[PDB]
């Protein structure tokens, strides 16, 4: 009747941190989004109660104000894309991103103008590398989530390959590069790829752990890693939570074993790499903090559950 | 017949690092110390084989060469203290400590000829050190070193009279007798931390958890020789067996968990300090970085040195399994 969500981040070295502009950033991004009147009534309640501004302000806590605002707009845009969610539709979004100063046709879905004004504002605080990184990764995200949604698992490892692109971590990480100029030889260095990949997988586990209760009550858990593990390893729910707790521990341990062992390029690259890795580590904390403080997964019991870990299995809806 | 030393640092973030000036510091420091002829023949060989310069150079791997040299002198001085304090007890400790402290307070006044040589060894150690240690660092060393000197004498007196300890109370004593607190003062060589930043409760906690891991590591390594000479009475391995009524295998697992809990508290909090702005924030970060590297440095030295495992420590470091020495 109840299951114990493992305390995977109990000793994680990055503490919960909140951007000081949360309140302002929240009120601005909410206004910018909601002036388009583009959410249904059901969606508006979700948008508000999920507080993607909180998610963003936790993730970008140590970043400047205007980037934090971009992060707020990005998280809200993720919702907009979901809510308004094929090749022509995504090509509208990409074309707005590619041409921020181009007037969007009057007979086009409003996501084109929302995407445009988002990027118009973003390029005022994301340097050219961060810009280039976001456009590349965001396109891959859109194709992964939208264009391939129709056609869309052998095992858990093949789920994690697809989910590394559908969760949207990679475009969110581009904002960490706002005032960085990491050359391709640094960003794709094998150790840094490993650290990034381990953080993304930890993000995946955490979100599936927290969405699982609601998803199973509705029969929507087919792609949740909890369910996938149960089927692959022939184990119950409690055994699945232990298995995923172990899997998360191995990832965290690999990160801890390595994140201070990056090689040295000289300055200013070494300081960039250090701050970028700080941003990866804080991302794992921020996602988890938000997953419990938000209404999204636990409604109004999340803070209690974060401390106590026991969750009541919801009955079939 | 054989115990397993827990792989306490398998996941520790700080990698082994060695000061690039190791060989020069080692040679100058060993010559400085050996010219006093303060060691018995057996103690001269041990001083050489243990190579306390390697310990200093691992722990101070990221510090300037001259500060690294001070660290080598300090690690060698601790051995001098261990060798010479053996003649002292609770009745002579204050006059004995005051000889050393008078030397540190006055690094330029040669000591009288009728006084134990540890005064002059301490004096010339400090005469060199004050050229690269700033005033907060100097003040921090003077204060913590004095406490350490009383503590080692008193601890030897308590052992001699079989004063009782359990796990928690042993740890309280050992935090002061291990010598980590004066050693940390060198980390402040070019810092000026205000008293309320240095004594901030989280920084105090981080230092304490660091020191406690250092204690556990050292006792795990020294246990084998200690238990074979019945000298393991105040060895956490023995204190755990007694306090918990468990066997060696059980005690090793208990200590593993105890180390894990300290490591988790340290990792959980090392990036949780409040902010005072610059240059106070950079100092705190670099200070804590030195605390994190000390844990690795102590461990690396404990296995590479001759001090605990002779020439077998690199195998033990890899395999963890150790054959119980028979009674000596
Ligand atoms: C809104 C997207 N997401 C994905 C877990 C909630 C479903 C938050 C998020 C986005 C990007 C990276 C990490 C988390
Ligand atoms: C382990 C090294 N030492 C030196 C006195 C005994 C050999 C204890 C110690 C450990 C850590 C820091 C300072 C001293
Ligand atoms: Mg999920
Ligand atoms: Mg000693
Ligand atoms: Mg010992």
List keywords for this structure.
16 helices; homodimer; Farnesyl Diphosphate Synthase; structural protein; binds magnesium ion; globular; two-stranded antiparallel ribbon; class I sesquiterpene synthase DbPROS (complex); binds N-benzyl-N,N-diethylethanaminium; mainly alpha; 317 residues
Write a structural description.
The structure is a homodimer. Chain A has 317 residues and is an all-alpha fold. Chain A has a single domain, classed as Farnesyl Diphosphate Synthase, CATH 1.10.600.10. The first copy, chain A, has helices at 22-34, 41-50, 52-59, 65-83, 87-98, 111-122, 128-147, 156-166, 169-174, 184-187, 190-217, 225-233, 237-258, 269-293, 295-298, 302-308, and strands at residues 2-4, 310-312. Chain A has a two-stranded antiparallel ribbon. Chain A starts with a strand and ends in a 5-residue tail after the last strand. The relative contact order of chain A is 0.15. In chain A, helix 1 packs parallel to helix 4. The A-B interface holds A 10-15, 253, 256-257, 259-261 and B 11-15, 264-265, 267-272. One magnesium ion (MG) binds next to helix 4 of chain B.
- The Rg value of chain A, from CA coordinates, equals 19 Å
Bin the helical content of chain A: 55-70%
The topology string of helices and strands of chain A comes to EHHHHHHHHHHHHHHHHE
What distance separates the N and C termini of chain A? 15 Å
CATH topology (fold) name of chain A: Farnesyl Diphosphate Synthase
Tell me the name of the CATH homologous superfamily of chain A.
Farnesyl Diphosphate Synthase
Q: Strands of the biggest beta sheet of chain A: in what spatial order?
A: 1-2
Task: Tell me the total number of β-strands of chain A.
Answer: 2
What does the largest sheet of chain A look like? Answer: 2 strands, antiparallel
**What is the CATH architecture term of chain A?**
Orthogonal Bundle
Residues in β-strands, percent of chain A: under 5%
Bound molecules: N-benzyl-N,N-diethylethanaminium, magnesium ion
Shape of chain A: globular
CATH class of chain A: Mainly Alpha
Cofactor (chain A): Mg(2+)
GO molecular function (chain A): metal ion binding; terpene synthase activity
EC number (chain A): 4.2.3.135
Family (chain A): Belongs to the terpene synthase family.
